[PDB]
Symmetry: C3
Subunit: 110 residues, 3 copies
Amino acid sequence: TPVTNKLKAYGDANFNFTNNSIADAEKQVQEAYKGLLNLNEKNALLVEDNTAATVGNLRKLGWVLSSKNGTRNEKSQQVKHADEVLFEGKGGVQVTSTSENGKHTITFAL
Amino acid sequence: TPVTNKLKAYGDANFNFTNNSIADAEKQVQEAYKGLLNLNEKNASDKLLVEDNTAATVGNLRKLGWVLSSKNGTRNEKSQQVKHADEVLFEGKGGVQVTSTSENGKHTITFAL
Amino acid sequence: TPVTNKLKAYGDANFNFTNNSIADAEKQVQEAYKGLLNLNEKNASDKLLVEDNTAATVGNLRKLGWVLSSKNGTRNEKSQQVKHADEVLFEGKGGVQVTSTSENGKHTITFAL
């Protein structure tokens, strides 16, 4: 049948400040985190560990990729499941990569 | 209890190109994505084959990941999959310095000469 | 929905060292791996401890991630844990330029100078 849980995404209404950490409070109000799952929330942990995850939950997993160039402020984007990050080396930066048993190395050199 | 769902991986033979977007088609045919979970598969109706309120399985977790690529100048992208518990090492040599810092889930990789 | 499974985290007790892989071993102590889900732990029958067709939990989701490492030439690796909703910044300074563009979830980070 249907399986559901009460996990919210950052950016959703009814976020409870006293129920979360300051880190999550900061994510709640940032655009870059909007729509990523809020996995933490604490009455002491609201959605218990032993709660079924849903496929909709998986669609909301990710991390935030940012780039800074000098003083210029950070630009941020979400890396969700099956998104791609390309590291591209132009002149005169050489970017090479190896991959052994789940360990991926991106090398940078002149 | 044996919990299952109908989620496929990219590269699976019976993915239907007609019913899905160009973005998904592009992932479906790349070896780089092969075996990653296909979360965004649609039917004729342009609705998701597997609805949000479906049990996720441990098998599903084993197919989560993102694609990591490097491209030098004009040459074509070399790609790998970063799956759960994989490691990505950014290494500086040959005149390039790479350093890192971490604080409260905020990680920084810094590149210098 | 109340649900459980037998998945443990790297760093947890009762890890059968001789029945598991070298990599898992290589991971179960490294601090950067601690608390990350041990997805592929084997049992005494030399099969996966938790089969593919088992419900995943929110507790599992809280343990998903990957390891981000850096190496400055000769020095040792510095490693840190990247979990869901962590941020990773790529910063360029004297005098590497690090710029980024994104389109349809493909993110390009470009290194110049």
